[PDB]
Design a protein around this ligand. Sequence first.
Ligand SMILES: [Zn+2]
Lengths: 573, 128
Amino acid sequence: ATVLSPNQNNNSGSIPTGYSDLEFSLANGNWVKNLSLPTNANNSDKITIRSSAAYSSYLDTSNTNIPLEVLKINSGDVYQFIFNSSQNKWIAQLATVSPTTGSNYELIPLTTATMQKVLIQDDKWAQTIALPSDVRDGTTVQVVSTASVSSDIDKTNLLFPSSFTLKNGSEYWFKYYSALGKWVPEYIKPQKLNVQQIGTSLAAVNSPLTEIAFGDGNWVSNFTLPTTANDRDRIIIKSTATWSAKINNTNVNSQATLTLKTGDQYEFMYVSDKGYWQLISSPTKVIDSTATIPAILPNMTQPTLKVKLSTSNWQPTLQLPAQAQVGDKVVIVSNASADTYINAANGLSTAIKNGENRRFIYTAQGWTVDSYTIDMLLVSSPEVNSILGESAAKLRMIEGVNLTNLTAENSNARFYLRDVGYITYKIPAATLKEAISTGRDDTTVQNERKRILADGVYYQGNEPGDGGCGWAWINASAYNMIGANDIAGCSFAAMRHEVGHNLGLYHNGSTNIGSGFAHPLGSTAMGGNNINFYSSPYLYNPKYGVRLGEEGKIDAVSVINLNAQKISLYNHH
Amino acid sequence: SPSEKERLSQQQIVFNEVKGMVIKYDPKVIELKKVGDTVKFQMLEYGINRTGKIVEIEPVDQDIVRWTGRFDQGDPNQNFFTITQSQKDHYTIMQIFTEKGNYSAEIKDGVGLVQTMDEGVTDQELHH
Ligand SMILES: [Zn+2]
C-alpha cells in the first residue's frame, strides 16, 4: 500500500492517479478542505481516504456511484473506493451490516462511522428493520435490499411515516439529525413505472417515490392519482410524448389545469392529516422579453403562465386567458416604458406600469387580482457608493428587491415590490438604529418619497448598527414605512426580512400569528431566512416536505395579505 | 478583453474556494459564456457540486448584465441560478437556488463571499 497526503501532493486534494493501491491520509498538520478522486484510472485501482484532522474534509463524488453530491469526511472516517472500467466510476466499499434473525423485528446495530450500509439479503432478512436512534449527528446510512421477499423500515424514528418498503433493488439513504431526533431521507431511488403498464389510474403506491413516464408508444389520455397513501409519499409524472395528456384533479389539492405536455413534469406529495395529494411542482409557460406576446393570452395548458413585457415585444392591451381552471395563475412583468392594459371577460380592467409585477388568479367568477404593488424608494448612502461603486450600490438593492418578489411569489403573498426611485443620500445619524428614526422626518427623502409617490422607503447605509445590521418598524403605518440594512454584516437577503417586519411580521417564537417558522431543515424569512418562503400552513419544504407553518399560530402569509393592499395605498394617484 | 490563446479557455467552474466562504472569481469566464454553455458550481462544504446551462442573457442597463441558468439534475420547475455583474465596478452578485439550500455570492475585484441566506441578516425587533 502507498501512503500519500496533501503535503506530499502539492498541498492539493486532487488524489493522483497511477497507483494500484493508494492511501490518502489527512492530519492536523497535513490537511486540505476539498478532495477529489482521479478520472483517469485502471480497473481494480484502490483508493482509501483516512482522516485524523480536527477540521472536516469534503469529497467530490461526481465520478463515484454515491448518489450524494458531497461526502463529509470527519476525524476517524475510513472511506475505500475501487474503480470500475465497465462503469467508469469509483465504487464505494462501505461498512455493511445486515439483519441476522429471520424474525419479524430486528434492531440494526450501527457503528460510529459517518457512512454505513444496511444490506438485506435472502439469507439475511427480517420482516421489519429498525434504525437505531441517538447516533452521532450526521450519520448517513444506505438501506438496500437484494432479497426476493420484501421488508420495511420501522417508522418511529423516521421524519415521516412514508412507504419505506424494501424489495429487490430498493435503495434509501438516511441522515440522522440530532436536532430532530429523526432519520431524514436524503436520497430515494425512484420506482419507475411506464403509464402503459398501469393504464389510466394508480390504485396505490409501493415506495416513497414513484416516477410515472409518458412517451410515444407509452401514453394514456388521462391519469388519476391514488385516493390515499402514506404520509409524504411522492409521485413524479414525466412526459416525452408528442401528444398532451391530462392529470385528473381528483384526490389532488388543486383545481388548476394539470395538462401534461412534451417535456412537462409534475410532482405530488401526499399529506395524511389533510387526506390529499399536495401539488409541489408544476410547469410554468414563460413568454420572455424576446418572444412575441399575443394580444389575447393563450388558454391555460399548465397551472401558471408568466408574460414578460419589454420594449421589443410591447403590447398596448392584453386579454387574460379566455379558458382556465380555478387556481390558474398569470404573472405579468413589464420593463417597457409605456403602460399595458389588462382585461378579462368578467370586466376586469387595469394597467401594468414599468417595473411592475402583477399576478392574477382565476376563480369561479373569472380572473381576479392576486397581488398589490408596493412602490419603494431606494436610498443609498454616499459612504456605501464609495466602497461598492455607484453602479454596484444600485445593483445590490435591486437584487434585494428581486429576492423579495421571488419569496413573496413562492409564498402566495399578495404583494410585489417595485422600485420607483433611487437617490444617493446620507441620513444624518451616527447609527443605523438612529437612521431608521430620523429617516421618517428627513426632508430630502420624504420630499422625494412624495414626488414619486413611493409607498415606502428603504435605506442602504454604512453606519454601525446598535446590536444588528438591519432595522425596520413592525406593522408600520405610512409614517413608519421605512427599512434599512448595512453592508458590513448584512447581505441583500436582509431586505425581504426587514420588509417582512414592515408588513407586520415578527421573529420565530413570537406570540403573534404573523411570525417566522424556524426548523433545522429550512427556516422561513422571519424565522431564520434560509429558504425562499414566508411562513404558511399551506406551504411545504420542497425537499423534505415539512409544513412551513401551523394553522392559527404560525402564518406569516395571512398577515401579509391583510396589510399588503393598505400599504400599497399609502401613496396613490 | 481581446487576447490570444486564452479567450478559448472555457472552464465550467465559476469560482474557487480559498461569516461565510471566501472565494476567488474571474469575471471574464462568465462573459465568454453564451446561451447553452455549461457552468459548474462547487461549494463542497455546503454540499453543492453540480453543473448548469446558461438559458438567458439580459442587459439590465448599459453597465449591468444578468445571466440566468438552470441546473441539469435538479427540479426543472423551481431550481435556477442568476449571475448579475457590473462592468464599471468589478462587482458581481450570484443567486444559487437549489432544493438543498439557497446561496448568495457577493464579489468585488475578484474576491467574494458565499454564505447561506441565514447569515444575510441578524437584527432585533424594534419597539416604540
Ligand atoms: Zn428582524
